[PDB]
């Protein structure tokens, strides 16, 4: 291992809405801190697409910038995660293990089909006849996990529902509820709408207004991490708390335990249901 | 001899109203990226409050720990700057320059008062008749010059207007909006809402959907800080984009520049009225 005392952390993009994401604001302050108190510096991929992301950590190996890394995202077959384990970085992963490898390699995860899981329960409490859980593009195992969660409670509870695949503009979200308008308007017909994340839930929201489509009035919303966005979007919004700078704070310890020396193959940081006004009834 | 070749960045807080908010993201990428080109680090302030702030400076300071700071905000009587002119550190403010001993140290700032007026002017051709600005408690230069800025655009036009200081604390602002509950379902009078800043806007449009008064049918409204929270906010409001990327890559630039060396007492960055739904009522 190299002597830098430096953690490299390599993400998704640097996109507005995903250096913006509170999520990762809260797991870069988790690890920094971390990091911080124990006298190692931390070093953010600035990088927007794969091939400059693999260009750009390759860069952070052979330059020997770094000690370790921790990878803010999971994916099968990740390139950048095979290229940790071609050129023998240690590493952490924040995500789920996916593969026989993955054994090897410490992973930080919430329980993401129990969160949705919670969540999806409680909207089916309220009383719904069918729900709609809406997603971002990518294989992301999140994804693939909150849906999950989303499909059992939902066909343990015998009830209708759809899966909405969107990238997060405007006019693309505007003609999917466009197509939903008079189903959404029906009084007779209780409906929920469900979203991956908070930055996306947050573009759902504006375009619910823009079509007069009330919550939770006429639909329920919610969606997952809860940060101070959620309790003040409009209206404010029932959302699973996943515990972002608690994340990052135990990514940042196992790294550090790795570089001290004993596999822990995966750490799992509870969530929290935060009940509010999108999913109660106004009387 | 012996620096470190690291640059202190100093906020007010940490919180996430504070930490989430892409103006101070913004910012503090932008000084970053400028600093990092020239070789030198930065060290991000964690405090939330004024004891523990002055206590991580002074400690910042007495344990050598960064060469330089830069104040990521401007309020009079501020202790944290009078602390780093009784300990000689190099300096700079992102803000308005307030006091007379001020004239030694750079500022980076906003044209806070003519972009207000821009968007006080903007809301009125419109077409208004009454205009309500709303404003978050604590004596920053920001919110003085936002107000100023209302108050003489608002006057000459010969409209009526208040002042309203509130705390982003929901059942406050909550009581605040069901007080012109009435006044504002009115279809005779036509208002305008404007908030200091994104982030206490968003507050503020909760509340307002709470009690289903409707933008731009309703009232109009408009804030300041561009960013993502306002494209896709309910519904997309107007703002002034004050530029924060920029303004950091300024700040980087001129605390390296009295690194290197004779100083330039203010430097402006432009900002950009952005006209959204909010107060497109036509």
Same mark, same amino acid.
């Given at each position: 291992?190299?002597?830098?005392?430096?953690?490299?952390?390599?993400?998704?993009?640097?996109?507005?809405?995903?250096? %913006?994401?509170?999520?990762?604001?809260?797991?870069?302050?988790?690890?920094?801190?971390?990091?911080?108190?124990?006298?190692?510096?931390? /070093?953010?991929?600035?990088?927007?697409?794969?091939?400059?992301?693999?260009?750009?950590?390759?860069?952070?190996?052979?330059?020997?910038?770094?000690?370790?890394?921790?990878?803010?995202?999971?994916?099968?077959?990740?390139?950048?995660?095979?290229?940790?384990?071609? @050129?023998?970085?240690?590493?952490?992963?924040?995500?789920?293990?996916?593969?026989?490898?993955?054994?090897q390699?410490t992973?930080?995860?919430?329980?993401?089909? %129990?969160a949705?899981?919670?969540?999806?329960?409680?909207?089916?409490? /309220?009383?719904?006849?069918?729900?709609?859980?809406?997603?971002?593009?990518?294989?992301? @195992?999140?994804?693939?996990?909150?849906?999950?969660?989303?499909?059992?409670?939902?066909? /343990?509870?015998?009830?209708?529902?759809?899966?909405?695949?969107?990238?997060?503009?405007?006019?693309v979200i505007?003609?999917?509820?466009?197509?939903?308008?008079?189903?959404?308007? $029906?009084?007779?017909?209780?409906?929920?709408?469900?979203?991956?994340?908070?930055?996306?839930? %947050?573009?759902?929201?504006?375009?619910?207004?823009?079509?007069?489509?009330?919550?939770?009035? $006429?639909?329920?919303?919610?969606?997952?991490?809860?940060?101070?966005?959620?309790?003040?979007?409009?209206p404010?919004?029932?959302?699973?708390?996943?515990?972002?700078?608690?994340?990052?704070? /135990?990514?940042?310890?196992?790294?550090?335990?790795?570089?001290?020396?004993?596999?822990?193959?995966?750490?799992?940081? $509870?969530?929290?249901?935060?009940?509010?006004?999108?999913?109660?009834? @106004?009387?």
């Open positions: 291992t190299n002597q830098t005392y430096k953690i490299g952390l390599v993400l998704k993009g640097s996109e507005e809405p995903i250096r %913006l994401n509170p999520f990762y604001i809260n797991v870069l302050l988790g690890i920094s801190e971390t990091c911080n108190q124990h006298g190692y510096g931390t /070093q953010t991929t600035v990088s927007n697409n794969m091939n400059d992301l693999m260009d750009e950590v390759y860069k952070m190996i052979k330059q020997r910038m770094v000690d370790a890394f921790i990878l803010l995202y999971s994916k099968e077959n990740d390139p950048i995660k095979q290229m940790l384990i071609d @050129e023998s970085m240690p590493f952490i992963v924040i995500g789920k293990p996916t593969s026989d490898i993955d054994h390699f992973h930080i995860d919430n329980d993401n089909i %129990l949705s899981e919670n969540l999806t329960r409680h909207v089916i409490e /309220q009383g719904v006849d069918e729900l709609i859980f809406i997603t971002e593009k990518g294989n992301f @195992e999140v994804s693939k996990d909150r849906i999950q969660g989303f499909e059992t409670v939902a066909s /343990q509870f015998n009830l209708d529902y759809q899966i909405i695949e969107t990238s997060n503009e405007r006019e505007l003609n999917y509820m466009q197509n939903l308008h008079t189903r959404l308007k $029906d009084p007779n017909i209780k409906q929920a709408i469900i979203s991956l994340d908070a930055m996306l839930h %947050l573009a759902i929201l504006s375009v619910l207004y823009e079509l007069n489509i009330e919550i939770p009035k $006429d639909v329920m919303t919610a969606t997952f991490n809860d940060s101070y966005l959620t309790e003040i979007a409009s404010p919004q029932t959302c699973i708390d996943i515990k972002p700078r608690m994340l990052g704070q /135990q990514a940042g310890s196992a790294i550090l335990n790795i570089l001290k020396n004993d596999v822990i193959e995966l750490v799992i940081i $509870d969530t929290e249901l935060k009940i509010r006004k999108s999913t109660q009834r @106004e009387g």
